[PDB]
Amino acid sequence: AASQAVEEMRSRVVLGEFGVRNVHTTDFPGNYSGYDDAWDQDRFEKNFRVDVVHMDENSLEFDMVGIDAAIANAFRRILLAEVPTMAVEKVLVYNNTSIVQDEILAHRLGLIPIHADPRLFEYRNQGDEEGTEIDTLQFRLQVRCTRNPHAAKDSSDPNELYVNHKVYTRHMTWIPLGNQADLFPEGTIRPVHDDILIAQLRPGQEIDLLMHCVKGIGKDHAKFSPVATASYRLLPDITLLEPVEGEAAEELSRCFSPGVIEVQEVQGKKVARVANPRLDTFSREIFRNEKLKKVVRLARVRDHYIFSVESTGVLPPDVLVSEAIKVLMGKCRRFLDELDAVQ
Amino acid sequence: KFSSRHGQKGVCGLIVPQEDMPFCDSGICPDIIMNPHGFPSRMTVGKLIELLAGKAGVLDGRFHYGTAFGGSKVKDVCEDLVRHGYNYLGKDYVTSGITGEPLEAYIYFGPVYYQKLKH
Amino acid sequence: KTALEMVQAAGTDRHCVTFVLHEEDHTLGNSLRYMIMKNPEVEFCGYTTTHPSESKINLRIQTRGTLPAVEPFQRGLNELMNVCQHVLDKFEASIKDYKDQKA
Amino acid sequence: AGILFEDIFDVKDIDPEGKKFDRVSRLHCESESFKMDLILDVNIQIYPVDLGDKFRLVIASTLYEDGTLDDGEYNPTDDRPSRADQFEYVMYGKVYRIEGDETSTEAATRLSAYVSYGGLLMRLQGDANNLHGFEVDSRVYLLMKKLA
Amino acid sequence: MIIPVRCFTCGKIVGNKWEAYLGLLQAEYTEGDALDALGLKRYCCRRMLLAHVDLIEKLLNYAPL
Amino acid sequence: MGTKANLVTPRNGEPLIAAIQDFLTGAYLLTLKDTFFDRAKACQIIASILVGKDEKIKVRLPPPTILKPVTLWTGKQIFSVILRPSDDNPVRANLRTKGKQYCGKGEDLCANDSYVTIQNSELMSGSMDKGTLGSGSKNNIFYILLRDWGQNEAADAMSRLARLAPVYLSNRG
Amino acid sequence: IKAVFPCPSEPALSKNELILTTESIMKKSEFLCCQDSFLQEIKKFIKGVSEKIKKTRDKYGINDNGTTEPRVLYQLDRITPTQVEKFLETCRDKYMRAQMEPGSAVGALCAQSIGE
């Protein structure tokens, strides 16, 4: 009925052949005739649930149910831009004789990630270049390329012919400042990857440099961003409007992603059921087939968001998501403090 | 000044933070956003074919050929996208970074070679 | 000096006020707009960035009746903080539970 | 009361020139009690109308039957008994053109009233005695309930 | 000239993968399969290894040494 | 030599400063019969107007075109705030013109919704196209605003469209 | 003029009265400055408006004296006296402001206009 039509309008975003309908969130007070949309903290608490679908080092997948898009988008935006990390800001260069330009070499070093925990360090004040034990970490890279004394005659391969031909992030060595050495045990502060190729050298070429690492947010530069990518997708809810049986099931299974549709022979006759809608990639190839277009509805549940966070390895992914929620709590508190001062 | 290799030359009007840029489900956000209005008067259908061929090629691992009077047909490239889980036409469902809610229209998203001009 | 409140007219009518929030972007404004638009009293709430270059958001709250508009804005910030506190606790409990099952 | 006009209408066509839009359909209707033809745009997503449906259409100057024309602003949140509790669909719009029938050169009585509901147009055409109380630049509520 | 340390759009570290990718190609591995083994699932990351031209080796032949 | 004093070409007198490209398409898409909006979406789009001297104007939100199964406004209603943003604005612009795509019959009850009527700064019919919002026409709203209410009222409206039209199109796609 | 100043509670008289009011307003000290050809053009337009009112009034019950019963019928071609005064003033000001200002550099404008 009309009540059914409104329920879909407020609960499902429907993907269509030419456009996506019901895109806007409409659950605000007075927008509907029979529904109360005023904020209820008790209702939000009861409905909200976070489920960890998968967690592996450097990747976390979790589902937030009952949260709104605006709150969810903030978490993704905070993770990408407002969670702090440590990265090289100033490179002091002595004796750089490599082909790579010093400005290019400085940029490459800034991009390399550091395993130091940002919460321990503090933001450097404007200027104040010298820095302190609390606000900075110092790394020294010194590599000189030399011919291998014992080498084969052909020496076609550079690796056999030269020693230290390639500068790798393993070469960078932490220089402790003040009490940092005691606070951080050996190996806690190191470049995360260990294999990134900073530069390539030939015999007689040397790179000597000192790098200062400072706390920063992603908004200032992308080098400070802690996540390779943070994104959210609404949960797919494919529904077959009419029962589909026979060879049609095989084509319907082909139209969708590999595991979403499973065809079962209930009476020795193939019948199609939706088993794992989460796997659907929404290629919308069903619309290409004229007969099946009317037998299926492609929709996304609006309030169920599957969040995927892949870290750069600077800090564990679960910690990053917890830090992002705390940063939003901080932004609200800063404004509340200003209101107290005004009145 | 950046040009697209199809005779469309543009100046960089705005530099936006990554958070404000629209994002597809895979998490790819666009490096460059190009106005749809350029194609109808210019009639550069070739650029539209090049995005589809490049998207198919990167996923396949193959380099497609757009040689004059020949080249990869649209029909073959579309089949490769379907195998890799993407829409044959290359239009992708995206969500808005600024508002957090899905954009009403599917947005064509793909890789295209851009050359920075000396000026 | 992050928040400057500009009243709509010389008469300083409280019901319509624009809050200029410094060092802010869509992340706080869009989340706050949703929380303060779930208040029945707020007739109109919207945020506008004056220019992409300046990091300031102007948030305009127009109340239904005599409410000063500071009260709806303050309530919205309080609600956002409570929503964040609940999500953090629920997320941490779920993450700990998952690790325990893995072990 | 604050009622201008009220009659039962039968739907006679749904789209004369094809489905130009998704949400909106151009309903051509005819009334039983009076000889009134009606052109009406409705949002057929929220309210679906079929080719045989019969509905009751009231046009009112005020949504509160006590005849208080006090409309400084309309508050959706506020809940009081009103006329809309008896009706399924309600629109707010402005009468913007009253126009005479051109199709007879003498002794004519048919009038056209045009109302625009934010761009959803209505033409109500009939005898002048039934369209009484319409005036240009006046604001009216359409109300509409389907009948079994 | 040298492999970019981070993917331009996504921001994944792709500097570590260049040496492995060259080795996988030296073996029978196909270019698509080699990228799959490295774990470059998204198209943005795959193009960086697939479209990279290694000129550092050629330029160094003319370097002083 | 000021732009406000030179909004019309001396050759024919047709307007030269007027909406182009994406400003024109955002407006045509906003003012189509299918564009319907909830209170939050309406408030955000109207909010873009309040900058650069519009900060000191109290916005008037028109009563929603749809009201009972669900409360919804129309795009034609949101475009009309560009013409009269506040209740103390004195502009009451009027236009009645055939749009491109006019079916030739039914002046305002055309099948294609291509006859524009604006009463008291409120679009009652039609979708805005190059004819009503673009350069080269004396049937432009900006031209009627210049001729009947002044250079300042026309320029204020054109600035408001350059804020509203981009925000709808970027979010719509 | 009719929409911006729609006058409810006004006489809404028409036909003979419209032409009489127009001629009285035209001959009031001002309008003498206006070129004679312009004044004739206003009279031709006003004569046309008066003719249109008569045809509609005859088709749908001519007002006996302004007392017909379906009062909606009066809205069919409604021109009220305040509207007639506003229309004639707006037309005089629009014409007077349309005059080329002395010192307009008329020749230079024409040369640029031909070139574009």
UniProtKB/Swiss-Prot annotation, chain A:
It is found in: Nucleus; Nucleus, Nucleolus; Cytoplasm, Cytosol. GO terms for molecular function: DNA binding; DNA-directed RNA polymerase activity; protein dimerization activity. The modification N-acetylalanine is found at residue 1. SUPFAM superfamilies: Insert subdomain of RNA polymerase alpha subunit, RBP11-like subunits of RNA polymerase. Keywords: Acetylation, Cytoplasm, Disease variant, DNA-directed RNA polymerase, Leukodystrophy, Nucleus, Phosphoprotein, Transcription. The keyword Membrane does not apply. InterPro entries: DNA-dir_RNA_pol_30-40kDasu_CS, DNA-dir_RNA_pol_insert, DNA-dir_RNA_pol_RpoA/D/Rpb3, RBP11-like, RNAP_Rpo3/Rpb3/RPAC1, RNAPI/III_AC40, RNApol_insert_sf, Rpo3/RPB3_RNA_Pol_subunit. Pfam families: RNA_pol_A_bac (PF01000), RNA_pol_L (PF01193). One of its GO terms (biological process) is transcription by RNA polymerase I. GO terms for cellular component: cytoplasm; cytosol; fibrillar center; nucleoplasm; nucleus; RNA polymerase I complex; RNA polymerase III complex. The keyword Phosphoprotein applies. Disulfide bonds: none annotated. The modification Phosphoserine is found at residue 3. It comes from the Eukaryota. Component of the RNA polymerase I and RNA polymerase III complexes consisting of at least 13 and 17 subunits, respectively. Pol I complex consists of a ten-subunit catalytic core composed of POLR1A/RPA1, POLR1B/RPA2, POLR1C/RPAC1, POLR1D/RPAC2, POLR1H/RPA12, POLR2E/RPABC1, POLR2F/RPABC2, POLR2H/RPABC3, POLR2K/RPABC4 and POLR2L/RPABC5; a mobile stalk subunit POLR1F/RPA43 protruding from the core and additional subunits homologous to general transcription factors POLR1E/RPA49 and POLR1G/RPA34. It comes from Homo sapiens. The gene is POLR1C.
From Swiss-Prot, chain D:
It comes from the Eukaryota. Residues 15-39 are annotated as: Non-specific ssDNA binding. One of its GO terms (biological process) is transcription by RNA polymerase II. The keyword Nucleus applies. The modification N-acetylalanine is found at residue 1. One of its GO terms (cellular component) is nucleus. DNA-dependent RNA polymerase catalyzes the transcription of DNA into RNA using the four ribonucleoside triphosphates as substrates. Common component of RNA polymerases I, II and III which synthesize ribosomal RNA precursors, mRNA precursors and many functional non-coding RNAs, and small RNAs, such as 5S rRNA and tRNAs, respectively. This is DNA-directed RNA polymerases I, II, and III subunit RPABC3. It comes from Homo sapiens.
From Swiss-Prot, chain E:
Pfam families: RNA_pol_N. Zn(2+) binds at residues 7, 10, 44-45. The keyword Nucleotide-binding does not apply. One of its GO terms (biological process) is regulation of transcription by RNA polymerase I. It is found in: Nucleus; Nucleus, Nucleolus. DNA-dependent RNA polymerase catalyzes the transcription of DNA into RNA using the four ribonucleoside triphosphates as substrates. Common component of RNA polymerases I, II and III which synthesize ribosomal RNA precursors, mRNA precursors and many functional non-coding RNAs, and a small RNAs, such as 5S rRNA and tRNAs, respectively. Coiled coil: none annotated. One of its GO terms (molecular function) is DNA-directed RNA polymerase activity. Belongs to the archaeal Rpo10/eukaryotic RPB10 RNA polymerase subunit family. GO terms for cellular component: cytosol; nucleoplasm; nucleus; RNA polymerase I complex; RNA polymerase II, core complex; RNA polymerase III complex. Component of the RNA polymerase I (Pol I), RNA polymerase II (Pol II) and RNA polymerase III (Pol III) complexes consisting of at least 13, 12 and 17 subunits, respectively. Pol I complex consists of a ten-subunit catalytic core composed of POLR1A/RPA1, POLR1B/RPA2, POLR1C/RPAC1, POLR1D/RPAC2, POLR1H/RPA12, POLR2E/RPABC1, POLR2F/RPABC2, POLR2H/RPABC3, POLR2K/RPABC4 and POLR2L/RPABC5; a mobile stalk subunit POLR1F/RPA43 protruding from the core and additional subunits homologous to general transcription factors POLR1E/RPA49 and POLR1G/RPA34.
Swiss-Prot record, chain G:
Catalytic core component of RNA polymerase III (Pol III), a DNA-dependent RNA polymerase which synthesizes small non-coding RNAs using the four ribonucleoside triphosphates as substrates. Synthesizes 5S rRNA, snRNAs, tRNAs and miRNAs from at least 500 distinct genomic loci. Pol III-mediated transcription cycle proceeds through transcription initiation, transcription elongation and transcription termination stages. During transcription initiation, Pol III is recruited to DNA promoters type I, II or III with the help of general transcription factors and other specific initiation factors. Expressed in the brain, in the cortex and the white matter (at protein level). It comes from the Eukaryota. It comes from Homo sapiens. This is DNA-directed RNA polymerase III subunit RPC1. Belongs to the RNA polymerase beta' chain family. It is found in: Nucleus; Cytoplasm, Cytosol. The gene is POLR3A.
